[PDB]
Every structure is written in structure tokens, then in C-alpha cells.
Paper text:
Here, the structure of the novel tetracycline antibiotic TP-6076, bound to both the Acinetobacter drug efflux pump [name] and the ribosome from [name], using single-particle cryo-electron microscopy (cryo-EM), is elucidated.
An extra density was observed in the binding protomer of [name] deep within the periplasmic cleft. This density corresponds to the bound TP-6076 antibiotic at the distal pocket of the binding protomer. The binding of TP-6076 is largely stabilized by both aromatic and hydrophobic interactions. Particularly, F178 and F616 participate in π-π stacking interactions with rings A and C, respectively. As Mg2+ is known to coordinate with tetracyclines in the ribosome, it is somewhat surprising that no Mg2+ ions were found to bind the TP-6076 drug in the [name]–TP-6076 structure. Surprisingly, in order to better accommodate the aminoethyl and trifluoromethyl ring modifications and the shorter pyrrolidine group, TP-6076 is flipped relative to Era in [name].
Residue numbers in the entry:
A (entry chain C): 98 to 337
B (entry chain A): 50 to 193
C (entry chain A): 242 to 481
D (entry chain B): 50 to 97
E (entry chain A): 579 to 1047
F (entry chain C): 723 to 770
G (entry chain B): 675 to 722
Write the structure that this text describes.
Amino acid sequence: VDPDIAQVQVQNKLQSATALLPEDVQRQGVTVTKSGASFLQVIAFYSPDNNLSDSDIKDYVNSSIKEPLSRVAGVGEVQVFGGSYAMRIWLDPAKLTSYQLTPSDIATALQAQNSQVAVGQLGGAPAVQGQVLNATVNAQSLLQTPEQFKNIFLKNTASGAEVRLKDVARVELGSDNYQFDSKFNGKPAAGLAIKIATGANALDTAEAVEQRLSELRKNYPTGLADKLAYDTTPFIRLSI
Amino acid sequence: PGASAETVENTVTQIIEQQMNGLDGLRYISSNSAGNGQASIQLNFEQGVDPDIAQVQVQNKLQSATALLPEDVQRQGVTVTKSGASFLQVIAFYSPDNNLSDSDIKDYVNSSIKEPLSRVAGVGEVQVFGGSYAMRIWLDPAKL
Amino acid sequence: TPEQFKNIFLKNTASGAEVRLKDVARVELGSDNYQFDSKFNGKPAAGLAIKIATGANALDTAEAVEQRLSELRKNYPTGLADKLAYDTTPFIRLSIESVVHTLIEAVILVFIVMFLFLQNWRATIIPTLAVPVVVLGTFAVINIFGFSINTLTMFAMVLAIGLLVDDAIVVVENVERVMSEDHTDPVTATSRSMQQISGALVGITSVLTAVFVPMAFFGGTTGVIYRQFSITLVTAMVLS
Amino acid sequence: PGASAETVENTVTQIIEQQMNGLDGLRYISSNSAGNGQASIQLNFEQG
Amino acid sequence: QLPPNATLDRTGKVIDTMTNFFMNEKDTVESIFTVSGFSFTGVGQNAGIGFVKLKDWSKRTTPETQIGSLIQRGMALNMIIKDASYVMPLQLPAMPELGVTAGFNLQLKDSSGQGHEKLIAARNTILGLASQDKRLVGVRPNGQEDTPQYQINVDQAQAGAMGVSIAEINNTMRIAWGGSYINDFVDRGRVKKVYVQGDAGSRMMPEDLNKWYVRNNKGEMVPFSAFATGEWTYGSPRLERYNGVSSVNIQGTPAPGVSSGDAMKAMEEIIGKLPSMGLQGFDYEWTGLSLEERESGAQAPFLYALSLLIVFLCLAALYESWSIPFSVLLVVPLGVIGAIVLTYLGMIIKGDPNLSNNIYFQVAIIAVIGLSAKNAILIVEFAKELQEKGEDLLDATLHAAKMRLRPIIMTTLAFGFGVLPLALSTGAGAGSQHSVGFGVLGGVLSATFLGIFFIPVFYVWIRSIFKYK
Amino acid sequence: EDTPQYQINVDQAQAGAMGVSIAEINNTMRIAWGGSYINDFVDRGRVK
Amino acid sequence: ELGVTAGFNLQLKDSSGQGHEKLIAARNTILGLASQDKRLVGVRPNGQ
Ligand SMILES: CCN(CC)[C@@H]1C(O)=C(C(N)=O)C(=O)[C@@]2(O)C(O)=C3C(=O)c4c(O)cc([C@@H]5CCCN5)c(C(F)(F)F)c4C[C@H]3C[C@@H]12
């Protein structure tokens, strides 16, 4: 049975169950993948001097190394075990009771505040006679920093005082998942796996990855090293 | 929507673009990110590649990529089309004696002459250069 | 109707006055899209641009488009007319027809060369009769393998006329000489002539088929062009 | 569910058939909208 | 193309000056269809396109009524219409499937990562250098150009205090300044759309924002002015990427007497000056038809070599020798000389950029090799037979040449008369026909006047070195 | 293998006297103990 | 695969948007003349 045809049939059937899925599940997104090539090699990105945390490196591989490695010839797929940062708000139950607030209120204040405004264009299509200029109106309204998140408005006290997010919660940039601890050699670590592409020489793809990696090490954050935790190329070279 | 050419690029463009790097038979990729919020990615395959099967492949790569898209982008939908290079024909509809108006002409080509031709054998794409009647409500800010 | 949208009820004010849609807005039947202004000969017009599907004959698609339009015109409103502003199909036909004119011209010119050398109607006719069989047969073989009639296939047929008459010419040139030397009958000479002529016949065919065979193997767009010439040429030479 | 045939034609069937263009091999499209709330659009393709 | 931030109305004024010109070129022009707001490169109020249908090829025989004559006169539009950035008339590609317009397409890649500004600086050096090369016509950036934008900044803090949601402001401002499709009505049995948007006077200028109000949680009306402010900014309307790297597309056309390859080589030389001038770290790639041009020229040396080899090996198997296949191979240059010579002279005399090394020329050379080989086999096969029958080599070679001459000339001349029609074609498709014809015809002529003499001589030489039996 | 787990048991009637609504109780806990993903934000050009 | 039952199938199609009651009116006129014509036998409306 042709693999591609099987995957597309499944995704198409999947389109008929999504409305019936819980909003939250839908929000994360549901993925369909297929069986295929084995991993040629896994590279472990680790901090020898304990300078960087796991969250930090998984984020670095994700924002930096994943895409340059994908364009390397022969690489069908690049997978990273890991994820980036998330903004985290941890709430004191007591501090909330003090100001008559409930977790839901904090949620409502966080949906409104963190939004992207969309406006339109100055000229406009059915424009007035004698319009000379058309431009684009854009509004920057999203929040990017932790401090912006802590100043978010919640309520005004009877005294007229201001209760913001900082008052009832601790706001930090933190990990997306706390479920897994990954290390290489007792040191914080993250892992990236390479899958060879169809109709390819692994021996040659492997050499190409090595050379791309060579260029990216120069721009590494302080304290990062890269080494191989898995390699299958020695087997194949030896067998030939 | 509401995003700059630079956010459309890092958020949507490059993320979609990296998923499609390992596709079989891909000659080259060209991409565009625009200030209106629109992103476009064109993929060119090598002679020999069946177009029907290549379409099923891109779509299979995109199901995982859509997750990593921002939520407002997923909400607006992501479109995958087999694409052509040049128009074979451009047909003009017009009034000689001006006994018919353009809004009327444009409506008749969108309601009566477009779908049948788009469904003519071998046709593929059909673009319209006029519009269709719509109910337009134009608000006064003051009176509101 | 737009009146029903003007009577939409919105609110009541404190006085108790009803606020309907007309009060806050103007309602009109307008347009879905206000983006483009299209004109034909400087006058208002609408247009339909058609981009053909992959894997299809432009000529055939064009006829179908027009045939559907023939049925559509009967139900047209009184003012409507339609013309083709941009059509590429006419050149394509004129290009196809030009080459067929060239083919006919070449056959006539080759006949004359042969007549100038052969000098007998009887001698000249035999090589000439080969041309209908070789060309008709090649067209047949090529359609078994899915090659259409196009400029490239047709250029190859024109290139082949001087080439496919060679075996025939090398046969009758000799029978004719044999006879003027030995004064033998048409059948005796032909059998003798055929013994001396055969080594040459196989050799000429072999060279002429082998030069054109490596082209078909080359891939890419250039390969698609090369294989039109090589299937036609190779088929023609074996047939000859 | 609960819909009139007219409501299924306006709200459901027409919206869908409008997106049904650009299909390789399409001989014809036939559709039905009914009082039991159901719409069926059948698409017939040419041989091969 | 018009200047940045242009209105649809300003674009329609230019398309009218353009349409008047074509509608007045009566001898060569039948019709025009125009769309303002649409372009292949992008949709914007500034963009525009026109489809011009010329008169029947029959009615256009004079030089003035030719296609390039039209294009050159229409290139005066750039100078006439001051407002527009560019007004460029462009021919279709030979195979329109492979492109929109003929010419060259290139991508300048920022391989180093220097910038977007740096990249545009490079484009503009390349643009002015290309203006000053006489082998080039109409070099232009393809794509949108940097435009002034209007940036609105909303103070989140004051928004929180007045009590207006940033999410709500978006709702009020998305429906007001842009449109919103809400629901559907039926017109004549067909569902249409209902749109809500503000009136044109309200959405025209930055000051018009002040006319709109947003309701707070207390239910009051708060001016847009209270929570936001606007500044005019400058930026890129659209960013382009080629193969994972940021790029710019540059498209142009060869000048009237120059070939496509020559224009391509001129551009690459210009890019070479980029480092010396001071912008370094820039790379380029070819795309579209130009990519393909590059690739086809490349495959030709391998094609010629492989074809020569198959002939050589087949001859050995057929004739059980190694020496004789070499004698037939040696005569091959004689035919190929005429082919290149007619093409080059022809181009010079005829003034034709089309008569050059192209795919059609390559098919012709293959044909010439087969012709030369065929001519050589006829003399040589017969010679070996006589030698095998006891004749001494010189006598046998000489006898063969006389016996096989009339046959050889007659066949060679018929291949020549066959391609004379291709060579002298005046109709649609003539350029392709000529490319094949001249190459084949030249080879015929050289083979007949030089190759025939050389076939006996090389055979004698090889056979003397390696004696039969 | 099966493992020990913990069940909260909410009395609607005690809550009713208090005034509290069931879905309010349910919502509190989902966010408090469970956690919630509200919306995306941009940091360094990547949406998180 | 074929439910036609060896009967000519005619799809009276309202292409001018006259309406359903007008489409039915047209059908009624067509079915009258058909019954009258000797060549045509058993021409029946298919739906409801
Ligand atoms: C994002 C959270 N999490 C991140 C921790 C991952 C995630 O949860 C997903 C999912 N649900 O999709 C998974 O894939 C995962 O669960 C999984 O399957 C793993 C493995 O099995 C695995 C392996 O087989 C071999 C190696 C290599 C081979 C050579 C040396 N060791 C490694 C490696 F060490 F590199 F990390 C792993 C890691 C996890 C990742 C999980």
C-alpha cells in the first residue's frame, strides 16, 4: 500500500472528527505522520560546564540549528526532542482571595490584554474622489516581555489602588513542558535526530551534516558542545 | 492578519518552508511574506515528478507544520494548490451599445459564465476581473 | 432587499425611540470586490482569464471552452457581447501548418535530386514510393508510445526524408548500373544487386540509428525535447 | 438536523458546490437537498 | 508600475495614456484589455497590466508593423509618462509554459546575512551598472518596492485604565477600517454576501481614526485618540526568499541584436564588480527559463561525446576491427566545420541573435556526424572486402572511391535538399527551422567538398600502420 | 499497571447553600491544578 | 452501476433563475406534450 496515499486518507477522515474534539485538544493541534526511514544519527547538544539549562538548549536547537540542518543535502527529516520557552504565570491562592479575584478573572484579563490588532489601509478600495495616498495601517499591540505581563491590569480596589498581575502571581519565562529531564554525560542536554531522504547516500549526507555543523559551532552560545550519541554510518562504511 | 512582513516571515513562511525541504524531486523554492499578512510559498519539482502525487506529498508535510503555525493563522486556513504558469486565454465581456451596465455585466459573468467554464475539461484555473453584487452596509462613525 | 436591511432593529433609546439600521448607515447593493478596474478598448468590461490544467492540449481545451460558450450565449442578457482579447492558440496552429508545408516542399525537392541522377521515371518512382510508407509507419509506431504530433516530432520527420530514402537509393542505383553493364533482366540484376548491396545497407542503418540513441537517455526538460527527435529518427531508420 | 430542504440548499449545498471547480476529469455534478436535513452532492468523473 | 503608495486612480490615469498609444498604433494593433490593481508580481492599487493583441500576421509585413518595432516605440512610454515608475512592453516566451515573459530572471541572494538594506543597496548598484550596458534593455526589479507605512502604537497601560480591551479595539477597528463579511443573502436564487465596513470618508486619512470610538467595560465611549498614537514609518511591503535565503528578483531583456546567453554573461560580469565596488558577500542563482538555458548548454559536451562513442563501438562490432572505426571517426571534424561556419556567417550576414548555439544546433551536429560516418562507411566497407579478396590496399581503396562516389553524392545531396525548406522558412516557427537547417546544410556542403577527399586518405594511413592480415 | 489515584467529591448541596456554581468550581480547578494555555505571544521572532 | 433503467433522462434546468414554481410550471407543459406524442412512452417526473 503506498505510504503517501495511506497518510492522506487518514488525514482526510480525521477532518470529520475535529469539531467533536475538545477545544483544548484542537488548540494544541492534532498531527498525522507515517513510518519510514530509520535515524541515521542523533546529535546531542549539551552544556559541559553546566552553564545552560535543558530548556535553554532545546530552545537554541529549535530556533537556530533545526532549519540550517534541514536544507543540507540528503536530509529528509530533522527531529528535535524538545521545545521552546513559554510565558508562565503561577498564581497565589491567597493573594487572589485578598483582592476578590478568581483564576478565571486572570484568564479574562490575559486574553484581552495580549491581542493583535488589525486595522486596514488608508486609501481603501472604494476610495473618495481625490485620494492620493494608499498605505497600510498596522498596530503593534502584543506583549513580548515578562514585565509587560506583570503590569497587566486587573481591578481597582475600593481605595482606588491598582492590582495588576504582579500582585497576585509570579510571572517568568519558563519551559513549555516540565515532564522530561534530558542529559548527556550528567550534563544538561537536548537531542536532535536526522533521517536520510529518499534515494540518497547516507555516507554522503552524513559528511554534509558534519560540515554544516562545522560552520554553526562558531556562532554557538557560550558553553555548548555537540557530539554524536548515535551513528549508523560506521556500520555501513564497514560493510561496503 | 495584522502582521508585518517580518513576522509573517519568521512565524509562518520559514516554518512552512523547512517542512518541505525533504520532498522528493524538488528543484527549487521561492517564498513571499507581505505586510497585509499574506504568505506564499511556491515549490518547483523536477521533470519526471507526477503532479498529482507531488500534491499529496506537500499536503502530508503540511499537517505537522500547521501545528507550529500561530493560532490566528490556522483559523484562517492554509491553502494548497497545483499551480500553473500562464494564461491561455483572456476573454472580455462588454456592452457595445451601452444598453447594459458594468455592475450588471460583472454580476452575470460571476453568476452565470464562470463556474461552467471552470468546469470545462482541461481548464484548471479561472480568474475574474470583475465583481459580484453584494449587500454593502456603510457605517457613519458619528451616528453610531 | 436593501429595505429589509434598513429596517433591522438595533436598539431603543431612553425616550423609547427605536434605532434602526438606516439611522446609523447607508445600505446599498454594491460589490464583493473593489480591487480591480478592467477595461476593453478603453471602456468598461469584465474579463475571464483561463489557465490550462497540467497534462492537456491547449488546442483541445480551447475548442471546448468555445463550445461551452456557444451554449451560454443563447441565454445572454441583451447588451452582452464577448471577444477574445488574448489568445495564443492561433499561432500554434499556424506553426503546425507551416511545418507541414515544409515537409511537402522537401519531398518534392528530393524527388528532383533523384530524377537528376536517376534520369528515368521508372528509376525515380521506387525510392519515392518509400516515403509514404516510412512516414506513415513512423507516425503509427510513435503513437503506440505516446508521442504526439508536434513541431519537434515534425521537424524530425523533415530531417528524415533525405535520410530515409538512402537505403532505397543505394539499392536502385546499383540495379540500374548492373543492368547497363550486363544487359540483364530486371529480376536477375535485382538479385545480384542485392548481394553486393547488403553489407552497405546494414552499415548505413546502423550508424544512423546509433548516433540518435544516446539522446533519449538524457533527462530533464532538454531530455524531453531530445527524445522527440530520437524516437522519430530511430523508428524511421529501422523502417527504411 | 431539524432543517427544511430550503435551509439545506441555501446554507449547505450551494456553499459547497461553489468550491467544486478545478477537478481533473469531472464529467458532471448532481446534487440533492431534503427535508430530513440531508444534502448529497455526487460528482462523476470521466473514465481513466 | 507606479511610484510607492500610489492610488488606483493614479494608476488608471497612466493605463489610459498607455491605452491611447496602442489604440493609435493602427497598422500593428487590433485590441487591448487592461486591468488596474492587478499585476503578476503583486496586487496593489499601484500595479497594472495590459494584454495587447496585434493585427493578423498577414496585415503586418512592413518593418514598422513588426513585433520589436512595436516594443521599441512602446519603450518611449517610460520617458513620456512621468508619473509611472516603469511602463514595459514584453514579448511572450518561446514556450510560454515555462514562463510569463521572455528575458532573464535572476535572484540576488544575501548569502552572508548582512541585511535587507544592504541587499537593496546591492540591487541598486547592479541596476545602474545594467543601465549603462548596451547589451541590455529594461533591467528592473521584479517585485514590490519599499514604501512608507502608517504605524499605530497603542499604549496598553492607558488602555487598561480607561478600561478598554485591546481585543475590543481590534473588533471596532477591523470592521471600521477594513471590511467584514458577516453573513449571506439570496439574490435571484444565488447566495451572495453581506459586508459591514465604515464609509469612505471615515477611513481615508490618519485623522479619520479620531472619528471612531470604543466602548469600555463601564459602557462609556472612549476616543481612539485616548489610547493610541500614530507615526509615519518606512518599510518593506514584501520580503522574498530563494532557497532559504533572502533574495531579490531581477528581470531584464537582451538588447536588439544580442542573444540570451550574452545578456546572461553580461549580468554575471556586473555582479563580479560588486566586491570591488564595496558590497561583498552577495551571491546569485539563475531561475526559470534562464536556469534551463544554462543547463542545456552544459549537457552538450557530454551528448556529443557519448554519441561519438556509440558509433565507434557499433562499427567495431559490425566490422571486427578497431582500426577502421578510428578512420571513420577522424573524418567527422570535416562535416562539423561547415555546420558551425554557416551558423556564424549566417548570423553575421542575417543579423540574427537566434542563429546561435542552441538546442536545435545540437540536434543538427548529431545529424552531421551520422552523415559523415555514413559517407565514410560506404567507401571503406567496400575497400576492406577487396583487400580481403586479395587486392593491394592502395588499389582497393582507389577502386572503392570511384564505385561509391555517385551513390554517396546522391544521398548526401538529398539530405541537403530536404533541409533547404527548413533553412528558407519565412513563417511562424521560422527561427527554430533555421537553426536546424543552417547547421545541417553547412555540414552537407563541407562533407561533400572536403570529407569525400579525406575518407580515402585516413583509411590508407591507418591500414598502412596496422596492416590487414 | 494500575496505581493509586485521588478523587475530589463536590457536594452540590453544600455548595448550593453557599451560592457557588458548579461550573465555577470546575473552572477554578482546571486552571489552578490542571493548567491552561490562553494565547500565543512573540519572543525574539518566534511565537511561544 | 446504472440506475437509469434504459430511459432517456432529461434534466430540465432553470438557468435563468426563474424559480422553483416556474421550473415546475415548465415541467408540467413538457409532460403534457410528451404524453400526447406517440413516440414517447411513460415519461415520468423522477422526484417528489
Ligand atoms: C518533547 C518532549 N520529549 C523530549 C524529551 C519527546 C516527546 O514527548 C515526543 C512525542 N510525544 O512525540 C517523543 O518522541 C519522545 O517521547 C521519545 O519517543 C523519545 C525517545 O524515545 C528517544 C530515543 O528512542 C532515542 C534517543 C537517542 C538515540 C541515541 C542516544 N539517545 C533519544 C534522545 F536521547 F536523544 F533524547 C530519545 C528521546 C525521547 C523524546 C520524547
